[PDB]
Design a protein around this ligand. Structure first.
Ligand SMILES: NC(=O)c1ccc[n+]([C@@H]2C[C@H](COP(=O)(O)OP(=O)(O)OC[C@H]3O[C@@H](n4cnc5c(N)ncnc54)[C@H](O)[C@@H]3O)[C@@H](O)[C@H]2O)c1
Ligand SMILES: [Zn+2]
Lengths: 5, 274
């Protein structure tokens, strides 16, 4: 999965 | 519930011989690197002109391709040689020097773990690194030094082959983490102690790693305050040293009996650098 916040 | 002193005792008594460490922006502020863009800063005023509509934009691909300059300003500041590791970094380094360190997981892009002397093989840099770069067009790889001159001179680094913009290997939003990040499947089950320093635990997948150890494993947090799973969904062997991270670290070091070795180490390393 992607880097996210 | 256990105490800081308890954990220290587990280490002194060799109950826990394999420590996984998770760290974040909090451990680098004492070196004088700002975090939230909240600060009135040498950074925030420099980026001020650039008119980032918001802080996240600096790590966003669409904005970068529209205007790479605000990001290269950040790069200029973080490029190796500008900042020095602090005692928290040197503590981690000591932890490796004594055989305790299974793996160090960092979200920081300042590269100070490597600079403090911690081997790459022990490090997982989950948000990437300025040690290398890639052309955004042709995918050709470059060592970080190849773009150093451009970066210091405020010129956007361009690919010598295709003229494409060359981007340091920092992870942007929506990008997957580097492949070494997958060591966490082996690492976390194998771990008999988890250390969490200076992190909000808001950035994923990195944050979730906190749950990945076994129930028997103590999770020690040294941070301003309770955050994430340690708050929402705590565990019995969880431990919080809340306050300034350097004080939390210095306390542990003293409890471990490493204070004097630690000072000799830092003194020697810091003196060398500046
Ligand atoms: N040095 C860097 O590489 C750097 C700097 C600034 C921002 N970032 C981004 C931040 C983000 C990852 O989240 P995270 O790493 O948790 O940063 P963060 O800013 O979201 O969290 C830092 C946490 O530690 C706390 N803290 C800060 N200073 C101290 C201190 N001196 N003593 C005790 N606690 C302190 C702070 O209040 C917060 O709880 C990624 O997108 C990074 O690229 C990285
Ligand atoms: Zn190219």
């Amino acid at each position: 999965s992607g880097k996210v916040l | 519930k256990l105490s800081l002193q308890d954990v220290a005792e587990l280490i002194r008594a060799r109950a826990c011989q394999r420590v996984v460490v998770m760290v974040g922006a909090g451990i680098s502020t004492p070196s004088g690197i700002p975090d939230f863009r909240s600060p009135g800063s040498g950074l925030y005023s420099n980026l001020q002109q650039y008119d980032l509509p918001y802080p996240e934009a600096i790590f966003e691909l669409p904005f970068f391709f529209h205007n790479p300059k605000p990001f290269f300003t950040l790069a200029k500041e973080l490029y190796p040689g500008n900042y020095k590791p602090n005692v928290t970094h040197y503590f981690l380094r000591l932890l490796h020097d004594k055989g305790l360190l299974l793996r160090l997981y960092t979200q920081n892009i300042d590269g100070l773990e490597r600079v403090s002397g911690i081997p790459a093989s022990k490090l997982v840099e989950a948000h990437g690194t300025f040690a290398s770069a890639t052309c955004t067009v042709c995918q050709r790889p470059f060592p970080g030094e190849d773009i150093r001159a451009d970066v210091m001179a405020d010129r956007v680094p361009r690919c010598p082959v295709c003229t494409g913009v060359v981007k340091p290997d920092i992870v942007f939003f929506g990008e997957p983490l580097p492949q070494r990040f997958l060591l966490h499947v082996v690492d976390f089950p194998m771990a008999d102690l988890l250390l969490i320093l200076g992190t909000s635990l808001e950035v994923e997948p990195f944050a979730s790693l906190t749950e990945a150890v076994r129930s028997s494993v103590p999770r020690l947090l040294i941070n301003r305050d309770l955050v994430g799973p340690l708050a929402w969904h705590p565990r019995s062997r969880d431990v919080a040293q809340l306050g300034d991270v350097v004080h939390g670290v210095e306390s542990l070091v003293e409890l471990l009996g490493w204070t004097e070795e630690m000072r000799d180490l830092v003194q020697r390393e810091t003196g060398k650098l500046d």
